[PDB]
Enzyme design. Structure first.
Site, mmCIF file in Angstrom:
data_model
loop_
_atom_site.group_PDB
_atom_site.id
_atom_site.type_symbol
_atom_site.label_atom_id
_atom_site.label_comp_id
_atom_site.label_asym_id
_atom_site.label_seq_id
_atom_site.Cartn_x
_atom_site.Cartn_y
_atom_site.Cartn_z
ATOM 1 N N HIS A 158 0.801 -1.241 0.000
ATOM 2 C CA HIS A 158 0.000 0.000 0.000
ATOM 3 C C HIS A 158 0.837 1.297 0.000
ATOM 4 O O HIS A 158 0.397 2.336 -0.476
ATOM 5 C CB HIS A 158 -1.054 -0.019 1.152
ATOM 6 C CG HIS A 158 -0.547 0.420 2.507
ATOM 7 N ND1 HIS A 158 -0.246 -0.471 3.521
ATOM 8 C CD2 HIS A 158 -0.420 1.651 3.049
ATOM 9 C CE1 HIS A 158 0.118 0.198 4.603
ATOM 10 N NE2 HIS A 158 0.026 1.492 4.335
ATOM 11 N N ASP A 168 0.007 -7.515 1.491
ATOM 12 C CA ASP A 168 0.463 -6.119 1.617
ATOM 13 C C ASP A 168 1.940 -5.991 1.808
ATOM 14 O O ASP A 168 2.395 -5.285 2.687
ATOM 15 C CB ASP A 168 -0.237 -5.378 2.758
ATOM 16 C CG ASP A 168 -0.180 -3.853 2.583
ATOM 17 O OD1 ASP A 168 0.036 -3.362 1.445
ATOM 18 O OD2 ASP A 168 -0.316 -3.129 3.585
ATOM 19 N N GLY A 215 3.449 6.607 9.254
ATOM 20 C CA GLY A 215 4.849 6.917 9.108
ATOM 21 C C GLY A 215 5.746 5.702 9.191
ATOM 22 O O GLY A 215 6.702 5.570 8.411
ATOM 23 N N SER A 270 4.677 2.493 9.030
ATOM 24 C CA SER A 270 4.230 1.404 8.180
ATOM 25 C C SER A 270 5.315 0.975 7.193
ATOM 26 O O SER A 270 5.999 1.795 6.611
ATOM 27 C CB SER A 270 2.969 1.848 7.405
ATOM 28 O OG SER A 270 2.213 0.707 6.983
ATOM 29 N N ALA A 309 -0.081 -0.378 8.736
ATOM 30 C CA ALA A 309 -0.995 0.564 9.373
ATOM 31 C C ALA A 309 -2.399 0.202 8.904
ATOM 32 O O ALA A 309 -2.714 0.270 7.725
ATOM 33 C CB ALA A 309 -0.653 1.962 8.997
ATOM 34 N N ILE A 310 -3.231 -0.261 9.823
ATOM 35 C CA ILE A 310 -4.612 -0.616 9.490
ATOM 36 C C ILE A 310 -5.417 0.672 9.259
ATOM 37 O O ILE A 310 -5.085 1.730 9.807
ATOM 38 C CB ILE A 310 -5.269 -1.467 10.618
ATOM 39 C CG1 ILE A 310 -6.302 -2.460 10.034
ATOM 40 C CG2 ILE A 310 -5.865 -0.559 11.744
ATOM 41 C CD1 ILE A 310 -7.349 -2.969 11.052
ATOM 42 N N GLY A 336 -7.757 -27.227 -2.749
ATOM 43 C CA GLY A 336 -9.151 -27.679 -2.727
ATOM 44 C C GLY A 336 -9.635 -28.264 -1.392
ATOM 45 O O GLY A 336 -10.446 -29.218 -1.341
ATOM 46 N N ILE A 337 -9.105 -27.740 -0.298
ATOM 47 C CA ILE A 337 -9.605 -28.139 1.004
ATOM 48 C C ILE A 337 -10.010 -27.003 1.953
ATOM 49 O O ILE A 337 -9.537 -25.874 1.818
ATOM 50 C CB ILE A 337 -8.570 -28.851 1.741
ATOM 51 C CG1 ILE A 337 -7.376 -27.980 1.971
ATOM 52 C CG2 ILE A 337 -8.123 -30.083 0.976
ATOM 53 C CD1 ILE A 337 -6.431 -28.714 2.916
#
Lengths: 388, 383, 150
Positions: free
Chosen positions: B49, B79, B142, B144, B161-162, B193-194
């Site tokens: 991001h 991310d 800052g 992140s 940073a959420i 496939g599980i």
């Protein structure tokens, strides 16, 4: 070092508490809780977490989801006791929150997530005790809804408080010593029935200590008032007394008095040790029911109960010279208020006799048991009222 | 006195400012941090991001150089992004093992927020699990892309940073993402496939295993999947994938997610208290959907049940109700929608699902269906 | 069903209305007399009012795993599961053992204590046989889950 080894051994004590309910509309509420008796399955959480619950489900770290029963709660201290019927339950060491100092390290732990985060459902934050003292531990270990009702622990991993999220770095915990006594009273009786003692205390600062004749580090609770006809007055307590002990609790801070007494049972005899002008006295008081006391007060003063009264003389057009007793205040629970007296009224005669000072009115009021006839002036008019 | 100052002084040189200019699909700026994880080849990790939509990426080191970086590659899902700078006298730090983290460990989150200078915060690991480390060491735009380090100053995470709730991406995953971006330029996620779920104690006991048994409980193996071919079944407990020991259900997705199509994956399970080693080939998600389509070319993606109902004005309607229909299906494309009742196929009556499925096998080219929809009807050709 | 209550205890009934109100508030523990007409023949009956939550606890104790669940037979082709046969949970009261264990409306129960569930009776049979816990495998949308009902 790390706090992880201590956290590991106490984590099984911290549970998730999930509530479903209807409010005076459908809602759910998630918080945390702490197992404080693993043999009887007793769990502490906040009252606000469980209020209005139709359903309460507890999830343990090991994954079991248990139906929980409410033993009782207490909104004033924001605590609630729950019970679960399970085995293989773990608790933690319970500490003494009176030994806590500002600057001690603490961890706040909750279990906000429960089953789909299994094995990592807990949440911990780190900080110090930032302040002490309704009465709360204050910390910079962030405390949030997730973790409200969970455990504040000291650095040896002992339970010192129950986290409570109220409402921005700053969180709060309810100190465990108070928690122990609220829980024990809820378990025995199902709720806290608070009674009356009838004294206000204030913090004895070093400055007041010295101005009252005590050394600067003297400790206790300063009594600032004792109300007439209260259990404390009967016991012989007076303003200016310093309380140094209540029953077996040494008193070093005013906050402890309210705490130690608030949760005694109506009917209990309490021992109070004070210093009065440097001389020690042991007193004994009986806690009474608040409503029974207020009924007593009414019974002994059935007409004038709840009225704030002062002598009055004033030229007051168009009435001429008005002499009487002014009602400065009237509680809405009084016989006076019910009869129609209101603040500002001047009582100018009672049972057809003139009233001059407060004492003359009090003497007249002791004439009949059934009623008191008062003539009141109210601005430009007047009326007769019967107080019964 | 005790202090984190010594360890930090040795690792500051690995932490860089990352400044970005570009145009949002108009001009914008984005400033973050990043961490040098290979000093010799100038390899730097940051968040996807931070660098998204960049025309220019500039990297500022502690010694003061501002360098032009190039994007080796990104993965928005985790991310992360990998940058390259061409410079010498670079410094890094010891890279740790995020699996050794526990709730309670001390951590420092460090960044270089300023650019054209460094910033550290302190706390603990709050929670472990998208398997983010949660911490109460404040993370903020800052810092992140910067480093989360343990008490010995080893890199255990990359910050993202959420309040008193920050997040980092565990370093063990970053390692894997970074090596795959450097080698191929991006991550090409495959399929197994599980579905897997937590093996709690009570579930262990319920299924005939010790209470402390550990692994990932298989709850479903899709038909025609690589896990199916390999021989996995529902109720198996995965205890190892390749060289990774599996102790928690979350480990399955992260370990398999990042394995490359055509990779051979060794899944060790316990089934009825016996270990079995199964071998599966990760498949390309799009060519597996293609394979499913090609083997069920007219009914693929349709949820179907037998239907019988007096339904004015049609009289007694017997057929097969379409309960659902994926928008990528040949059915959907032909005009079939959920709620349609298929009342005939290739001109024959349809009674139950199996009778539609049989008719559907009659030719390879098209399936003619008559569908009843509300009060109306329509013929559709599924091709 | 189909009976016509003519009288309750002391009061005579001419209105459906009178029945609710008269028993609506009648007290737990109270015995109550009810007079009715079946196809012109009158019967006289005695019932005992019970507490709403004790009754609910009775039901729960008598049906520890499946209490509160609305259930019907289910057969349907459902991508990506293939052909699904089982018992669909059409409703689940929030106070049940099933809801607490995680069962939600829409789940399809496809086995119980490691055995296949085809119709409602087969599930009810498996639940009666076993005691203490019920292990259920449910289909939920594109996914699945093992659930342990206690």
């Amino acid at each position: 070092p790390s706090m992880a080894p201590v956290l590991k051994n106490i984590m099984p004590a911290i549970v998730n508490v999930a509530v479903q309910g209807y409010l005076p509309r459908k809602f759910e509420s998630i918080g945390s809780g702490v197992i404080i008796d693993p043999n009887n399955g007793v769990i502490i959480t906040n009252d606000h977490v469980i209020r209005n619950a139709s359903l309460i489900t507890v999830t343990l770290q090991d994954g079991r989801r248990l139906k929980a029963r409410l033993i009782g709660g207490d909104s004033e201290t924001d605590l609630a006791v729950l019970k679960i019927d399970a085995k293989n339950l773990k608790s933690l060491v319970i500490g003494d929150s009176d030994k806590l100092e500002v600057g001690d390290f603490v961890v706040a732990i909750g279990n906000p997530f429960g089953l789909n985060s299994f094995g990592n459902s807990q949440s911990a934050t780190f900080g110090i005790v930032s302040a002490l003292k309704e009465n709360f531990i204050q910390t910079d270990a962030a405390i949030n809804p997730g973790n409200s009702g969970g455990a504040l622990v000291n650095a040896k991993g002992e339970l010192i408080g129950i986290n409570t999220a109220i409402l921005v770095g700053i969180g709060f915990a309810i100190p465990i010593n108070m928690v122990k006594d609220v829980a024990q009273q809820i378990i025995k009786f199902g709720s806290i029935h608070r009674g009356l003692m009838g004294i206000f205390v204030q913090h004895l600062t070093p400055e007041l200590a010295q101005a009252m004749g005590y050394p600067e580090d003297f400790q206790g609770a300063l009594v600032s008032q004792v109300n007439p006809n209260s259990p404390a007055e009967l016991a012989g307590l007076k303003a200016g007394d310093i309380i140094t002990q209540i029953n077996d609790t040494k008193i070093t801070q005013a906050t402890q008095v309210k705490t130690t007494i608030s949760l005694l049972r109506v009917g209990s005899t309490v021992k109070i040790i004070v210093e009065r002008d440097n001389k020690p006295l042991t007193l004994s008081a009986v806690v009474t029911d608040i409503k029974s006391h207020e009924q007593k007060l009414q019974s002994n003063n059935p007409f004038l109960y709840g009225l704030a009264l002062r002598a009055f003389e004033q030229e007051s057009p168009p009435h001429g010279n008005v002499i009487g007793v002014q009602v400065v205040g009237a509680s809405e629970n009084s016989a006076g208020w019910r009869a129609g007296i209101r603040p500002g009224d001047i009582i100018i005669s009672a049972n057809k006799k003139p009233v001059t000072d407060v004492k003359s009115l009090q003497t007249i009021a002791q004439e009949k048991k059934k009623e008191l006839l008062v003539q009141v002036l109210r601005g430009p008019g007047s009326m007769y009222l019967l107080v019964i």
